[PDB]
């Protein structure tokens, strides 16, 4: 995996040090070039995963996300041409070097091999994020975003390191396939339940779930436009990849011990749809939103179940395209409007045609309506929670019951009826924004036509 | 561009918060009074009436006709609640208590007649069905080791 | 036999022609009322011979090409269900949709999207028909799914109306409350 | 005044209306009758 | 659909409102103030007010009832109203 | 009789 | 301001058979029950005491409210009717026309002259029309919402753009 | 609204149930609970129909009955003879939208039965139109009616149904009968009531051609795949005389108490504003509330 | 042909012959007889000439062979080598299982269409060989997780075997 | 008499038939005073900028951002911990919670002990 | 109907009733039952793809039908002969269904009387 | 939408109900 | 009902200044001037057959544009569903499976040849 790491690493020079005005286009190039070299990466061997060396190795379950990082980084990267046209050229190579640090360390935790290091790389992508939110944010709430943001990631980490470095003393190794291979099951002794609680509250963390979610809404607010589509993106599928991988030993103890936070999902996802429907904020709703999407993607982990294993490697995929595509369209309209305030600007169709019929496409992908992988996805886990306790689907249902409630709301409050009077800036939509959500929609359905690649490593 | 008068801070206590709480939403004072104090996060905010946008006049030169609000003037707490769109406070034809007691009259009268229609559905004057081969059993879902006795018929 | 196997397909594809013609945007605005007035005509006159087809034979047909996945027992397919219900269904839906939509050219004179009506209209009747004949309930779906959305959109045509709009979000929700069902 | 007319006002029953030349049906009576007839006379 | 031209509704209100034989022909006018000059309060005005607006195919705005009294101002409201412009 | 149909046109 | 007796009656007069029409349907029918008397109206004039003026609202107002329909006349144009806000969808702001480019300025060359033109009226009507309205405004926040004229000759009235550049009701 | 809410979509979901009948006719239960909300759709949409004020909405309110038509179809074991009544319900409920939308474009883009300019005698093709459809969505003798309703009716009455299904489908049939000839003595009744500019006339050759294309089939295609079409439903074909035409007496009986409202309102007197004819003409009764209580119910434990 | 009887089961075909009882000229006999003069004909010449330009140049390719390797019951507890050997042969079988499962379903489903009202009595037997493909499926894979391994799977192979003694000795007592 | 028209939270009387509306008292009238002065001047503000062609951007009153204020952050400075508070607090925080949990258990030990000696039904259900 | 008068408004025992119609030995006063002859057979209906609910004892007159049916394209006024020999099966199997019904109608109206003067004879 | 329209409107007459 | 010779002067004043504006909005004769693109030459002599506008001509450009309707969208889309259908849709098992037609007792068989028995003795329930 030297093949892809190596050239984000040495690229970062690059940025470092090429003209005040060509970094943008160099970086953006190289961008799309390393996304093409990973995008070799999908192929997964059998059953095996794709081993690399004794510190890398990639599999179905990996590559989706590594690929998914790497057509990333374009993305924010020429987002934030509108918003650091303005300031210093030292500076603008710094933000640059944030992300690129960023991406490299998403892909150094996504191809780790041994426990360890994925959780050294995974407390790696906080300094990037912190830097991103803190200095370059626009309003004040910020440093209260950046302070939530760090302190409850780590406070659900170090639990996580004490375990590991329990684990690592007791079993003998923490690589990925040692554990997996000699994996034992895991008693109901008293000790064992609090071994599950340091293992998985962890990745609980980075994935709000109901009451242990406000990090993401006050830090997503006020995140710069760039950085939020990041974290709303991948630093929530990072803990699914740890789910998905410390789940293999934390069985067969998970079977009862789950019950707490599986509801707590189920009931959560209804609430932060419930909470959904009544929004001051767009950044607000699409976060909220967001984190629905995650309680759902948390119960079809927590089932253990290959259809809900499925269901939930589509969805992280998918639900991060959809967020990071909604977030663009919130980060436009705010950028023309200087504000963020709901229904501070309706009928938006009037203005600017296509850049509604983006929004239409956004919230069809919001929907989960079929064909889409966000439908598929979301119906494996639908499959998989009713083979799991039969009435399950009256929550889900009531699921997917609000979010086409919010999502075609926020269509006819932005987009539909008629324009506020008196707003009178609004230009016609650049070409950045429109080619951007281009860059995202189309091969959302691209991937959706050959959905085995992000199906799962089960297949 | 901004002061501290029109952010929503404390709740009003004494007649002079209450007319400083009066400017701060742009409405005056004799009419103004803030929820509850039962912690909610009420503050200062009014409790303004929970009526609708439906029930105000269209043909006014609303500043924001989409919902009939005018430029800068207090909103409801819940504005997005009792917009067009939404839930709307404009008037029924009669009482609401009497819509209720209708919605309920209908649709719990009818269950109940539903249930002694089901309970003697209608049926019309004829016989069995006459169907031969123990009710066709081995060509629709039937054992080829199994024999039952064939269900026949004679004319009259 | 084989030609019942085709053309009750190509009555799909004749349609799905004006629709990703409208993508290229080289059509005139003003020829593709026209244009997909034509094509729903024809794919009327053209789902007629599977009729008098199967009313020759009496067969009923369903058709699964090329499959998206293979999980474990799932073998997903495009599986068309062409059977007696599907193909006697079609061929009068397509005719009403080509009468209305001569109609709707009567009617919609004065729309600048008048194209895109009936483009819409267009779209709505694909998933319908592909509704009609799904073997699979993830077509099924599909083709709900689709019917439901379009729909919604179709209400809300006149988006500039509030009670269009309001109208859309209650249709949505009941079908949606069905879907829930579903 | 134009409204009570016989121009516009004065229409035909809402029968009438449904017999729309109900006297070409009658003619169709005949037509069909000796349609069957002359089919069965010279067969 | 007619653009509903100045003269259209010109003779839409020689003929409505022209319609009122409360008031002989003679004395009638376009600037005709009923009030005083025919001697009729904007009470005897509302009636017809309601039956014009159900001809042209429009509604008077009901904050707009008064004031709008002479043929004058029925062609002022009708032509500003229905961008009357040609 | 014809005239001006304003729209948010852009040739972007 | 406030709605005053005669304002009160007046609107009560409009609303009463407007209404009753849709009960009647037929004009003949119409004119019937209009003509049941106008003067009831009219019989009871002589209401000095504007208590009995009142007690006999108490009766008309509250008489209307059951004896109109349930589901009664809208018109098209009309709010809740079918033509109210259906062509909104059209209409555009007239500041829409800056953003047009060179292509498209010089494809209607003339039309965006004669608006470059009408802004520069715009421009000398501008401080024309505030140093007007400043002068003449009284203090305490004018003192109702009729707007001051152009007193002068070739000047243009306050507050005059929004109003005249407004979309037409038909922008198709 | 012609299209789609008359009868492409709305009719998915008995169209679904006819494509799962194998399923649906192991178990009779849900039958008799598919009769109950097909009996009680069209008492619902037909009685808020027998009093409504615009034209769109008296026919969509027939559709949705309609469609609880073939609901109750699917309930007594017939998703074949469903089949053929949504076959044939394409043909002539989207006619008889379609002469809605015709006089609605000449009618001054407007859609309520009142203020109608006697369009009968300026509105000559729709009219026929409107009454043939109307006679038709009442069980016309072979026309789309004859092998709709109709069937479905004696059906219902010959198999062995739900008792309060089997009268409410004949209040059903006489209120079909009801409002479809409203709309006739509404539009085309002889007296006008319109702008005075007179815009009542379907010259338009196109619309004359689509109108004529979906009457043809409105007149031929009821009967043009009636008997065509495979044996394929129960053939009932002895049966009781009184019950033999209970379709047929219910639509008689409809036409006459239909003809008897619309000469109750063409007298001098005053018409009732008591609380039957509220619930008549609000919709069902059951919108208003639904839309105002749940949802702020809802929103506000959101807040 | 490419495929075979033996795993893709094919009723015998068998057509009416019709016989018209009226002098009307067969109408879908004649449009079928003009689609394929204009439609058959041309895409079989397009074909004929894609035949022969791959018959011009032929390349061949392989079953890709695998050979049986010491399974978790044989295989050393802690022994790492063997053990991942194990997990490949028993992840390939159960890949294995899924496919011949799937071939199953698409007889099943073919035959309920080809077999006509009457496939509740001839695909019975299918139907038959499905009922127990099902019930040895879930005895060989079934309830194992997410993390399904071939250890995991021994332990259910475990479960069956105890509880099957258990029955036969509890018959015994 | 007539059928009496009573308001309500959600179909409140309508403005003419309330006794009172009717019964305006001069103090009243006087009250409303000149709220249509402000009113309007507050329109002279935005009719000025906006008719202003030297002003081009986004105008917003303090109105808007003082609801989103007072329903974002002002809620929890203000917040106090009432008894009631408190007591609906926990009611929906634990009462959903537990139900939901003890609903899902219950079904989920209903099929454990009907599967463990094979009353439920595995047959056709072997894609779990 | 008289039926639902008598069971349902009347005595519902005095009346068959229809989910246990009939509920009586088939020789109710019928010694030598010869069941109704075999015409329709299960092979033939089942080779002609037709419908459960339609493989009555009239099966024989629908199958011989599509015969005509198939041959007859293009036409749909043919096959009548048959199809009036359907039809007329038809009508003898509904008045063979209803006067089975009417047949333990009698015999329950046999069976009141008949358990009212033999056992309430004291 | 010109003059000279086919049915063109004489004032409050039949607008000429084409006989075809 | 009180028109104070302020707002008298406002409307009227707005409404021959909106006047004015709208005569302005008049588009000169060279307006909407739009530019040169390219025609097809065959097209162009279609065209060039209907500025006389014969019946014949009229007919004749009908048929065309319908028969090139046609060929694009009835036998293009036949050209490649049979192709994918007949070989590489039937290539591929159990693809396309089809509804046994009703085999009738007396139908022969066109292969094997072999008549199934008519059948048997029928009531003979004359009308
Ligand atoms: C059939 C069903 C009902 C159908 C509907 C028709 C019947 C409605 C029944 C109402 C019964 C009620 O008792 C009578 C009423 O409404 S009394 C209203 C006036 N009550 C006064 O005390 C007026 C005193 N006078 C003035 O206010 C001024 O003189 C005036 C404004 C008239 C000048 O106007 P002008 O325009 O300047
Ligand atoms: C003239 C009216 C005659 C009766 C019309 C309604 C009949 C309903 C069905 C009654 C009989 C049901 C059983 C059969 O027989």
């Known amino acids: 995996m030297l093949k892809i790491i190596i050239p984000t690493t040495m690229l970062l020079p690059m940025t470092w040090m090429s003209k005040h005005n060509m970094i943008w286009i160099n970086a953006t190039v190289h961008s799309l070039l390393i996304s093409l070299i990973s995008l070799s990466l999908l192929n997964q061997l059998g059953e095996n995963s794709l081993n690399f060396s004794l510190t890398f190795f990639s599999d179905s379950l990996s590559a989706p996300l590594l690929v998914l990082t790497t057509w990333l980084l374009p993305l924010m990267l020429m987002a934030s041409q509108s918003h650091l046209s303005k300031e210093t050229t030292t500076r603008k190579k710094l933000y640059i070097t944030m992300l690129i640090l960023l991406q490299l360390f998403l892909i150094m935790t996504f191809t780790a091999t041994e426990l360890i290091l994925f959780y050294i790389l995974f407390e790696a992508t906080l300094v990037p994020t912190l830097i991103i939110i803190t200095r370059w944010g626009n309003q004040t709430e910020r440093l209260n975003a950046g302070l939530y943001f760090l302190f409850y990631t780590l406070a659900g980490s170090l639990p996580l390191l004490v375990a590991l470095v329990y684990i690592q003393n007791t079993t003998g190794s923490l690589n990925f396939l040692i554990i997996h291979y000699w994996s034992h099951p895991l008693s109901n002794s008293w000790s064992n339940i609090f071994m599950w609680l340091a293992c998985i509250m962890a990745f609980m963390v980075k994935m709000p779930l109901y009451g242990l979610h406000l990090w993401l809404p006050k830090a997503h607010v006020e995140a710069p436009i760039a950085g939020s589509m990041v974290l709303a993106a991948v630093l929530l599928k990072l803990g699914g990849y740890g789910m998905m991988r410390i789940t293999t030993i934390l069985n067969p103890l998970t079977n009862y011990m789950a019950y707490p936070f599986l509801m707590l999902s189920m009931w959560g996802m209804i609430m932060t749809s419930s909470i959904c429907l009544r929004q001051t904020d767009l950044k607000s709703l699409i976060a909220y939103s967001s984190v629905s999407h995650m309680a759902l993607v948390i119960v079809a982990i927590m089932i253990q179940t290959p259809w809900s294993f499925m269901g939930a490697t589509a969805l992280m995929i998918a639900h991060g395209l959809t967020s990071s595509m909604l977030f663009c369209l919130a980060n436009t309209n705010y950028e023309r409007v200087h504000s963020r305030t709901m229904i501070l600007a309706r009928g938006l169709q009037t203005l600017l045609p296509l850049m509604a019929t983006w929004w239409l496409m956004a919230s069809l992908t919001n929907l989960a309506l079929p064909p889409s992988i966000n439908l598929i996805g979301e119906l494996f886990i639908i499959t998989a929670s009713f083979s799991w306790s039969n009435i399950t689907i009256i929550l889900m249902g009531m699921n997917m019951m609000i979010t086409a409630l919010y999502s075609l709301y926020m269509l006819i409050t932005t987009q539909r009826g008629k324009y506020t009077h008196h707003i009178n800036n609004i230009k016609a939509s650049f070409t950045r924004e429109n080619a951007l959500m281009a860059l995202h929609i189309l091969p959302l359905l691209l991937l959706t036509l050959n959905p085995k690649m992000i199906l799962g490593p089960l297949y | ?156 | ?182 | ?43 | 659909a007619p653009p509903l031209t100045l003269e259209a509704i010109k003779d839409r209100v020689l003929y409505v409102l022209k319609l009122y034989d409360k008031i002989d022909p003679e004395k009638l006018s376009v600037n005709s103030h009923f009030m005083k000059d025919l001697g009729l309060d904007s009470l005897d005005q509302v009636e017809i007010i309601m039956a014009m607006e159900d001809e042209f195919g429009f509604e008077i705005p009901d904050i707009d009832a008064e004031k709008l009294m002479c043929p004058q101002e029925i062609v002022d409201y009708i032509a500003d109203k229905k961008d009357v412009y040609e | 009789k014809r005239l001006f149909i304003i729209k948010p046109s852009g040739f972007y | ?172 | 609204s012609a299209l789609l809410h008359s009868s492409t979509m709305v009719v998915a979901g008995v169209f679904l149930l006819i494509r799962f009948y194998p399923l649906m006719e192991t178990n009779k239960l849900v039958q008799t609970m598919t009769l109950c909300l097909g009996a009680i759709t069209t008492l619902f949409t037909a009685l808020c129909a027998i009093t409504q004020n615009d034209i769109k909405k008296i026919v969509a309110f027939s559709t949705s009955s309609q469609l609880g038509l073939m609901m109750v179809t699917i309930g007594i074991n017939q998703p074949h003879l469903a089949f053929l009544h949504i076959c044939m319900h394409a043909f002539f409920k989207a006619m008889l939208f379609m002469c809605s939308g015709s006089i609605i474009h000449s009618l001054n883009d407007e859609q309520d039965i009142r203020k109608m300019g006697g369009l009968y005698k300026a509105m000559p093709f729709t009219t026929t139109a409107l009454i043939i459809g109307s006679l038709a969505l009442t069980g016309m003798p072979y026309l789309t009616g004859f092998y709709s309703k109709d069937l479905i009716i004696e059906a219902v009455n010959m198999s062995y149904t739900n008792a309060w299904a089997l009268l409410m489908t004949l209040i059903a049939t006489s209120l079909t009968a009801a409002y479809s000839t409203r709309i006739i003595f509404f539009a085309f009744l002889g007296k006008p009531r319109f702008p005075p500019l007179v815009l009542i006339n379907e010259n338009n050759p196109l619309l004359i051609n689509s109108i004529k294309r979906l009457l043809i089939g409105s007149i031929f295609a009821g009967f043009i795949i009636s008997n065509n079409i495979p044996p394929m439903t129960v053939p009932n074909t002895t049966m009781p005389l009184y019950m033999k035409m209970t379709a047929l007496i219910v639509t008689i009986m409809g036409f006459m108490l239909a003809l008897e409202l619309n000469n109750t309102t063409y007298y001098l007197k005053f018409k009732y504003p008591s609380q039957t004819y509220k619930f008549s003409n609000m919709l069902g009764y059951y919108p208003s509330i639904m839309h105002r209580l749940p949802t702020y119910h809802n929103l506000s434990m959101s807040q | ?173 | 008499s007539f059928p009496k028209y009573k308001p309500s939270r959600l179909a409140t009387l309508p403005a003419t038939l309330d006794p009172a509306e009717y019964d305006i008292s001069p103090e009243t009238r006087k009250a409303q005073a000149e709220r249509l002065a402000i009113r309007s001047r507050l329109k002279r503000e935005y009719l000025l900028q906006y008719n202003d062609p030297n002003r081009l951007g986004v105008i917003e009153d303090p109105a808007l951002i003082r609801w989103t204020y007072a329903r974002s952050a002002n809620i929890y400075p203000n917040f106090r911990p009432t008894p009631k508070t408190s007591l609906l607090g926990a009611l929906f925080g634990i009462g959903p919670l537990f139900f939901w949990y003890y609903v899902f258990k219950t079904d989920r030990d209903k099929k454990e002990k009907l599967i463990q000696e094979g009353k439920l039904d595995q047959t056709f259900n072997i894609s779990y | ?122 | 939408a010109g003059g000279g329209v086919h049915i063109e409107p004489r004032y409050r007459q039949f607008p000429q109900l084409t006989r075809s | ?127």
């Open chain 9, 1 to 173: 042909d490419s495929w075979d009887k033996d795993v893709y089961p094919e009723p015998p075909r068998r057509t009416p012959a019709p016989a018209p009882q009226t002098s009307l000229p067969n109408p879908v006999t004649y449009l079928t007889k003009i689609f394929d003069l204009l439609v058959d004909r041309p895409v079989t010449l397009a074909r004929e000439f894609i035949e022969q330009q791959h018959a011009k140049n032929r390349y061949y390719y392989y079953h890709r062979e695998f050979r049986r390797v010491p399974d978790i019951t044989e295989c050393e507890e802690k022994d790492i080598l063997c053990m991942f050997e194990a997990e490949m042969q028993w992840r390939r079988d159960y890949k294995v299982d899924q496919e011949i499962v799937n071939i199953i379903q698409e007889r099943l489903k073919a035959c309920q269409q080809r077999e006509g009202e009457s496939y509740r009595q001839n695909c019975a037997k299918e139907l038959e060989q499905f009922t127990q493909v099902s019930k040895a499926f879930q005895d060989r894979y079934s309830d194992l997780g997410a993390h399904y391994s071939a250890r995991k799977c021994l332990a259910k192979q475990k479960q069956r075997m105890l509880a099957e003694r258990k029955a036969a000795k509890e018959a015994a007592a």
């Open chain 3, 1 to 182: 036999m084989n030609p019942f196997a085709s053309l009750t397909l190509t009555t799909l594809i004749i349609l799905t022609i004006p629709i990703m013609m409208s993508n290229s945007n080289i059509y005139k605005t003003n020829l593709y009322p026209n244009y997909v007035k034509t094509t729903v005509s024809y794919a009327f006159t053209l789902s007629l011979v599977p009729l008098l087809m199967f009313m020759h034979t009496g067969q009923e047909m369903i058709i699964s090409n090329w499959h998206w996945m293979t999980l474990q027992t799932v073998e997903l397919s495009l599986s068309f269900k062409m059977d007696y219900f599907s193909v006697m269904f079609i061929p009068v839906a397509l005719f009403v949709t080509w009468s209305i939509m001569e109609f709707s050219m009567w009617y919609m004179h004065s729309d600048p999207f008048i194209n895109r009506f009936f483009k819409y209209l267009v779209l709505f009747l694909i998933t319908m028909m592909i509704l009609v004949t799904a073997n699979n309930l993830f077509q099924l779906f599909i083709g709900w799914e689709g019917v439901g959305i379009m729909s919604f959109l179709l209400i809300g045509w006149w988006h500039g109306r509030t009670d269009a709009n309001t109208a859309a979000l209650q249709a949505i929700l009941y079908n949606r409350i069905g879907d829930i069902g579903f």
């Open chain 4, 1 to 43: 005044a134009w409204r009570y007319s016989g121009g516009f006002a004065n229409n035909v029953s809402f029968v009438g209306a449904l017999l729309k030349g109900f006297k070409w049906g009658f003619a169709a009576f005949v037509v069909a009758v000796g349609a069957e007839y002359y089919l069965e006379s010279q067969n």
């Open chain 13, 1 to 127: 009902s009180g028109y104070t010779p302020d707002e008298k002067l406002r409307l009227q004043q707005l409404r021959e200044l909106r006047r004015r504006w709208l005569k302005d909005q008049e588009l000169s004769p060279r307006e909407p001037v739009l530019p040169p693109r390219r025609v097809w030459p065959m097209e162009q002599f279609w065209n060039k057959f209907l500025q006389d506008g014969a019946p014949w001509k009229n007919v004749i450009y009908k048929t065309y544009r319908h028969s090139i309707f046609a060929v694009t969208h009835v036998l293009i889309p036949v050209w490649i569903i049979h192709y994918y259908l007949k070989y590489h849709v039937t290539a591929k098992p159990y693809t396309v499976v089809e509804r046994k037609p009703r085999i009738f007792p007396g139908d022969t068989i066109l292969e094997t040849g072999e008549v199934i028995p008519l059948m048997k003795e029928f009531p003979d329930q004359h009308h």
């Open chain 2, 1 to 156: 561009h901004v002061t501290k008068d029109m952010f929503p801070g404390p709740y009003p206590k004494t007649p002079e918060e209450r007319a400083a709480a009066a400017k701060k939403y742009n409405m005056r004072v004799e009419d103004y009074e803030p929820y509850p104090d039962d912690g909610m996060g009420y503050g200062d905010y009014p409790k303004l009436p929970d009526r609708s946008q439906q029930e105000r006049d269209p043909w006014y030169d609303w500043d924001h006709p989409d919902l009939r609000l005018n430029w800068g003037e207090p909103i409801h707490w819940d504005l997005d609640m009792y917009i067009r769109n939404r839930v709307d406070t404009s008037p029924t034809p009669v009482s609401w208590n009497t819509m209720c007691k209708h919605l309920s009259g209908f649709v719990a009268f009818m269950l109940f007649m539903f249930w002694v229609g089901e309970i003697y559905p209608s049926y019309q004057p004829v016989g069995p069905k006459q169907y031969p081969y123990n009710d066709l059993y081995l060509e629709r879902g039937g054992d080829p080791t199994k024999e039952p006795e064939p269900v026949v018929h004679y004319e009259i």
């Open chain 11, 1 to 122: 109907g008289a039926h639902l008068a008598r069971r349902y408004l009347g005595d519902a025992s005095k009346e068959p009733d229809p989910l246990r119609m009939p509920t009586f030995p088939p020789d109710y006063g019928f010694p030598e039952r010869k069941e109704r002859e075999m015409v329709a057979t299960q092979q033939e209906m089942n080779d002609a793809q037709l419908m459960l609910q339609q493989r009555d004892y009239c099966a024989h007159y629908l199958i011989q039908l599509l015969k005509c049916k198939r041959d007859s394209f293009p036409n749909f006024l043919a096959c009548k002969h048959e199809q009036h020999d359907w039809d007329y099966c038809e009508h003898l199997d509904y008045v063979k269904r209803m006067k089975e019904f009417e047949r333990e109608r009698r015999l329950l109206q046999r069976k009141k009387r008949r358990e009212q003067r033999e056992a309430e004879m004291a």
């Open chain 7, 1 to 172: 301001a406030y709605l005053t007796h005669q304002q009160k009656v007046l609107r009560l007069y409009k609303r009463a058979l407007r209404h009753l029409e849709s009960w009647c349907v037929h004009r003949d029918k119409y004119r019937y029950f209009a003509c049941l008397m106008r003067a009831r109206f009219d019989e009871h004039k002589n209401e000095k005491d504007m208590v009995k003026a009142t007690q006999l609202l108490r009766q008309a107002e509250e008489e209307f409210w059951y004896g109109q329909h349930p589901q009664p006349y809208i018109f098209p144009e009309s709010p809740g009717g079918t033509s109210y806000e259906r062509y909104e969808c059209y209409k555009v702001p007239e500041w829409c026309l800056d953003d047009w480019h060179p292509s498209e300025k010089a494809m209607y060359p003339d039309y965006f002259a004669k608006r470059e033109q009408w802004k520069r009226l715009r421009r000398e009507s501008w401080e024309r029309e505030v140093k007007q309205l400043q002068e003449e405004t009284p203090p305490g926040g004018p003192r109702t919402e009729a707007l001051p004229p152009a007193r002068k000759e070739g000047d243009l009235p306050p507050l005059w753009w929004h109003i005249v550049t407004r979309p037409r009701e038909r922008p198709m």
